[PDB]
Amino acid sequence: LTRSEAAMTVLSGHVVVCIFGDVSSALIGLRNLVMPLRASNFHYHELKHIVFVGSIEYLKREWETLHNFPKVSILPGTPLSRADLRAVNINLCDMCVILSANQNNIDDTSLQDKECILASLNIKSMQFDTTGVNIPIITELVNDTNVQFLDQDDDDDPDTELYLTQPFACGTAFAVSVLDSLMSATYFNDNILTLIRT
């Protein structure tokens, strides 16, 4: 797509995916996110549309595994562009998903989730003819201590565990560090990994 066709194509109940890709960034593997939405125990009229916003270079470095799926679209823009997020009907989606690929290349532990946090704040600071705070949003963070910047009404404490933090308790944030108990669970009960996988 581009600005024109994105704005005139009415979208509602869709999934908006915000990608901070780069030509040197690692491959996220968006196949694994698309396939559960595309599963066949949903009727075809019930399939939520998917649109990806991000660097066109990174989209043409991953599209080679996403061309057999329906209801998908690309918009070659910036996840932080207010014009793009307005053109994509962000206020009418069933989810916005924010992912970053530049997480391992840099080693600062401060700027790893800066783009995701800024995008989340920009989406929550939007005025619609309702505010942007009620939008359904999920973001993936590399550092668990960065979850304190996602919300402002909640009380922040570095000692507080991620599972106990308000944005995680609400399903607004997700980090790969919560999966570490799957080693122990899998070992004790060999069927649990397949029950979860299915």
Partner 1 sequence: LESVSNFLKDFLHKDRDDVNVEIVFLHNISPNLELEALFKRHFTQVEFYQGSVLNPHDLARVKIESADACLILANKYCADPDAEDASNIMRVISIKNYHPKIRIITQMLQYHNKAHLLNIPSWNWKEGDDAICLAELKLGFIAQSCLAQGLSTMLANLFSMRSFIKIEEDTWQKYYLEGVSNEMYTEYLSSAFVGLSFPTVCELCFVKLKLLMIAIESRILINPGNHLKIQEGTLGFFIASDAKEVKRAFFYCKACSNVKKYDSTGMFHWCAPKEIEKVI
Partner 2 sequence: LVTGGATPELEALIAEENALRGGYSTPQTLANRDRCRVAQLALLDGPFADLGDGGCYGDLFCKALKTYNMLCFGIYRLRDAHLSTPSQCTKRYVITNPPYEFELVPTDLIFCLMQFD
Q: Please give the annotated binding residues for Ca(2+), written as ranges.
A: 148, 151, 154, 156
Sign, CA dihedral 139-75-103-124, equals negative
C-alpha span between 99 and 53 (Å, rounded): 11
Sign, CA dihedral 91-96-98-99, equals negative
Ordered strands of the 173-175 beta sheet: 72-75, 50-53, 15-20, 95-100, 137-141, 173-175
Q: How far is the CB of 145 from partner 1 (least distance, A)?
A: 9
For partner 2, the binding residues (CB under 8 A) are 81-83, 86
Out of Ca ion, partner 2, partner 1, none, what residue 169 binds, judged by CB under 5 to 8 A for its kind, is: none
103 contacts partner 1 (rule: CB under 8 A): no
Q: Which is nearer to partner 1, 4 or 191 (CB)?
A: 4
Burial of residue 118 (CB within 10 Å: 0-12, 13-18, 19+) is middle
Q: How far is the CB of 152 from Ca ion (least distance, A)?
A: 6
Residues 140-179 that bind partner 1 (CB under 8 A): 148-149, 152, 156-158
121 contacts partner 1 (rule: CB under 8 A): yes
List residues binding partner 1 (CB under 8 A).
80, 82, 110-111, 114, 117-118, 121-122, 124-125, 133, 148-149, 152, 156-158
